[PDB]
Design goal:
Bound molecules: a molecule of 3 linked components (GLC-FRU-FRU)
Protein name (chains A, B, C): Inulin fructotransferase (DFA-I-forming)
EC number (chains A, B, C): 4.2.2.17
CATH architecture of chain A: 3 Solenoid
Keywords (chains A, B, C): Lyase
CATH class of chain A: Mainly Beta
Shape of chain A: globular
InterPro entries (chains A, B, C): NosD_dom, Pectin_lyas_fold, Pectin_lyase_fold/virulence
Largest interface: A-B, 64 and 67 residues
CATH topology of chain A: Pectate Lyase C-like
Enzyme class (chains A, B, C): lyase
Oligomer: homotrimer
Chain lengths: 416, 416, 416
């Protein structure tokens, strides 16, 4: 074989009923043909698996345990299942289409057990031993979790962002992975990648999923670029933990994730030049000694949800949280724009001054030239007693920077 | 069928004479085979249409009225038709190539009627009713308008930037569209997309077209990233109207569009980190209550046209226009570099001080740490009487910031 | 033919033994079939050459002398050959894979002569005469130089970063070229492009090569975006000379190149919003009248090498060099973050204060709002006597900005 596979032209199995069995069957063939690891300076180059545009049901989890496997399609096929499930059911046979399309993988797996959301993943990338599994590519296909289900919260089942399904789950240490041009829709978790080195997530459309991008465990020298991201109110849009040298740029993050970016103990990383829009506070969270990070030239918009099916759904956080919350040392917050739109009548807790940037802990945080435009009075910067020895420049007037001048360097934005 | 089409292997029609008829014939086949919208949790996944590298004439407009249609090629095939048409005609048979290449669609349509430039579009994406037409992809092919024609302006016909031809025209509301890796050349309009939600224009080469990117009507949460853009002096390089949450980054915009970026009533968007180069003033225009936008870390160069066929062609605007013109409220202009190269002898109007940043209207505009390097004296910032209550920091000395100190906060850049 | 070629389905030659002969044979066929340059408004559209995933040996240099040639694969196949060659040899038969994969081109060429590293290039793009060779595309395949060899330096042969092999070498003036989604590994030079106009290097993985990206001779309006880059200590990560309008963004440059970015006489370009990490000083060098450049919102980390096989390897430069060295006029250094981790016991020369930003020559350089976090005392900015008339704002306290106040405008970062 020439290492080129098409799921519609594989003899064993049929991809309409179960594309999981088909791809696993292909992976078996690749391992059979690529047994030896050092023959003429080569051995296991891997292979490419092609999904033509189509509606493929996946009933078996795809296990990927080989390096250099590309899975490509010919279309991300996103349509807004959220909108359609909220359209009256009578009007459905008049709609031009109902379901997502492209090269579509329908995740027909049940929810996973105790700490086993991995068991409900369409694609599981896992391997033990050395070296790190490397250069697996997912390109330009659709992954659909189809329906959200009742969570006992009382809301309409299709608006819970709950089904125990994952698009792609990478369990093992990985080097040089790529997720590009994908479409993820209607999954509790779109993309969960543990232990990622030199990972690239470029130019995906990841929307109407509970959580979109979670980089878990740890990682190094990775980048999340040029994505369109929208999550649900109990989940993360972009999340990373214990990462170093992460680059988060050029993303357009829209609602309705709890956060837009959420870092737990992330260091020496850069969250710069993204468009961020949420309907709740707590848009960007640097937590648990997230230190020496650059947060720069981003555009923040926080406003009220206008779409009436989610009117009065929130993420549990009040306006004193801040749009940018920082618990950690020596970060750099430079050149950001913040737009705060809130109605004075509905500011929680009653009658507080909403806060934009908040330093809850740590020291040496540099905050310079940030511009806040708000329809109400705001605390541009709020430095808790738990944080000290911070420099805060041109980010508000003396009224707008609430902080103890004894232990912090402040310059007020000139006025009048 | 497996929803995979190749224009060179379609029985009905021949793509050398008319690829328009061929693709429309394919679209008819897709609609025939994908009638039902809800069969086994699916129905109309769409399809992919492949253009091998070749010279294809298009004589019929391609109408796209289905979601999830990908049209892909294998090469953007840009060569500079402008350069070649200005090379002496005697030398033409010595040139290695003459025409553009790649997967080439030659637009052989006549110009459109009154308000109907849409009729001269090679690709028309239009549909009525719900939902929004979604996830149409144009990838890695060439669209050539072949020749520019006489406009009665007296200039050489091939330098008018005038033929009534459009590359791609999207008329209807659309969600999750993509234009990637394309080559557009020698069209009056390269890419015109009305009413665009979550649109992505990543990594295209869009040059020697009258106007390149126009986002018209309205739109939300879209992004124009990583493009190489060059327009003509009566047209737009990047234009958007009535957009929210637009992200314009990582573009290299070269001459010779009138503007590099032009916003009409665009809000809460970000034009950051682009390289911008024009031969005229008015490089970036925020007009008609373009408000709460971030303009950051861009590199502006304005200089004289050196290429002698366009020597003394301009866009009608004088040096008092400004490089960055702002008419709107609460924008953020941070960290930009401006290089102004003009000859003192040819500054229009005679003997004026050229202006870099200009605030013609609105209030609350924040302008901090911008650096201007000019071979002459310049008005780094000019605040008209019509604009007030702006903050202007470290963007010039007191001489260089022309503004009424009573109603604006100014800090001069320290000196000497 | 339809201009579509597959290296595994070409009759003349076999790509396992010599893919160079196969591709050159294909190029001969394309020139044979595309003789005429103006037939029905077309002539030489070019072609696409496909490499399925596989282990292909290249023994003949591929000469590309036609416009619009795409060479595509289906996988970048990077694995870390550096790690594996430093793993004990006994453990090798237990490793899951050894070699890189994807669509793999193994460079089996010997080293080149005097000033002829071009002779050891797998892919040579060269043409004389007009117009500029245009829109050649390299996409999503692997280029492997296989082994590094003894350089007489005493270090292990596989750690010398020395074999005289180049991945892709472009010798001639070129317009609208693309290198996207590639994997380069174990080459002395990954990508060397002379005389490049409107070049795009988007989304490549270029690691464990002596030098990765060199833009040589001259060039205009090009961009290096969204790459993962790692070089060797005698070479360049990103290098450009005599370029204008270069855009370097969204890159994650990791060790162990001498520099992360190195400019020789580069003007009116932008190095903004990259993550930069080196184990040595001299991370970003603007040299030989590199002027009017924007260096903005980047994240710099300099620390000690932790990997014991390269412990005590360096690039020859001392801590007085600076992380950002500037020799040229009117540059803009805005919004950068710098993390300096050094052990006081090993600061060369003995007991000096390490410098972060250094201005060795030129005038009018604007340096505003830069934040330095260091485990030791540092010279945040050092202005040599050879540089004067610079503005330096909020980039350190008066102690931390070493400069002559008579001929430079300084504002200290407020304190305490
Ligand atoms: O809020 C975004 C979030 O909601 C979803 C599901 O509805 O899309 C909503 C959507 O519309 C919102 O924004 C438009 C413009 O502000 C507004 O008219 C509408 O009322 C809002 O619901 O948001 C995007 C653009 O931001 C639109 O494409 C979409 O219709 C979901 O897809 C997303 O996660
Ligand atoms: O000015 C760009 C504009 O003109 C076109 C058509 O000529 O390309 C011109 C071009 O050259 C210009 O820039 C070079 C370098 O400054 C200069 O030598 C020449 O005189 C200029 O015309 O511009 C790009 C680079 O900016 C070159 O590739 C090209 O030759 C057109 O393509 C473009 O819209
Ligand atoms: O230093 C990067 C440079 O080295 C190479 C070859 O070893 O990769 C090294 C690598 O690990 C380094 O970083 C990790 C995390 O800091 C550390 O544990 C290890 O000791 C270091 O060698 O660097 C990248 C991430 O930066 C890892 O993927 C890789 O293991 C080479 O690939 C690169 O040019």
């Amino acid at each position: 074989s020439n290492n080129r596979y098409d799921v519609t032209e594989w003899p064993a199995g049929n991809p309409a009923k179960d594309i999981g069995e088909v791809i696993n069957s292909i992976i078996a063939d690749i391992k059979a043909r690529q047994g030896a690891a050092d023959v003429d300076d080569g051995g296991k180059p891997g292979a490419v698996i092609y999904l033509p545009p189509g509606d493929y049901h996946l009933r078996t989890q795809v296990l990927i345990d080989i390096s250099f496997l590309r899975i490509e399609g010919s279309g991300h096929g996103f349509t807004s299942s959220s909108i359609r499930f909220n359209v009256p059911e009578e009007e459905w046979p008049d709609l031009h289409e109902l379901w997502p399309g492209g090269s579509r993988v329908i995740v027909d797996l049940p929810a996973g057990g105790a700490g086993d959301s991995a068991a409900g993943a369409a694609f599981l990338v896992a391997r033990e031993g050395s070296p790190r599994i490397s250069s697996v590519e997912f390109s330009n296909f659709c992954i659909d979790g189809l329906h959200f289900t009742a969570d006992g919260s009382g809301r309409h089942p299709e608006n819970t962002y709950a089904n125990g399904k994952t698009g792609i789950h990478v369990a093992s240490a990985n080097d040089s992975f790529r997720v590009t041009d994908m479409g993820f829709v209607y999954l509790e978790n779109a993309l969960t990648i543990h232990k990622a080195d030199a990972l690239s997530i470029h130019h995906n459309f990841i929307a109407e999923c509970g959580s979109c991008i979670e980089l878990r465990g740890w990682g190094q020298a990775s980048k999340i670029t040029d994505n369109l991201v929208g999550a649900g109110p109990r989940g993360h849009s972009i999340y990373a933990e214990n990462h170093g040298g992460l680059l988060v740029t050029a993303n357009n993050v829209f609602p309705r994730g709890a956060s837009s970016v959420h870092f737990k103990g992330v260091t020496r990383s850069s969250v710069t030049n993204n468009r961020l829009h949420a309907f709740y506070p707590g848009m960007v969270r640097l937590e648990e000694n997230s230190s020496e990070n650059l947060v720069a030239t981003n555009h923040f918009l926080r406003d009220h949800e206008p779409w009436t099916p989610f009117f009065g759904v929130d993420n549990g956080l009040d306006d004193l949280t801040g749009l940018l919350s920082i618990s950690g040392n020596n970060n750099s917050v430079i050149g950001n724009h913040f737009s705060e739109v809130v109605d004075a009548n509905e500011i929680r807790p009653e009658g507080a001054t909403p806060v934009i940037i908040r330093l809850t802990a740590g020291t040496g945080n540099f905050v310079s030239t940030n511009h806040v435009v708000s329809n109400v009075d705001t605390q541009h910067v709020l430095v808790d007693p738990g944080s000290a020895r911070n420099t805060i420049l041109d980010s508000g007037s003396d009224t707008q920077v609430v902080a103890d001048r004894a232990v912090n360097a402040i310059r007020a934005t000139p006025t009048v």
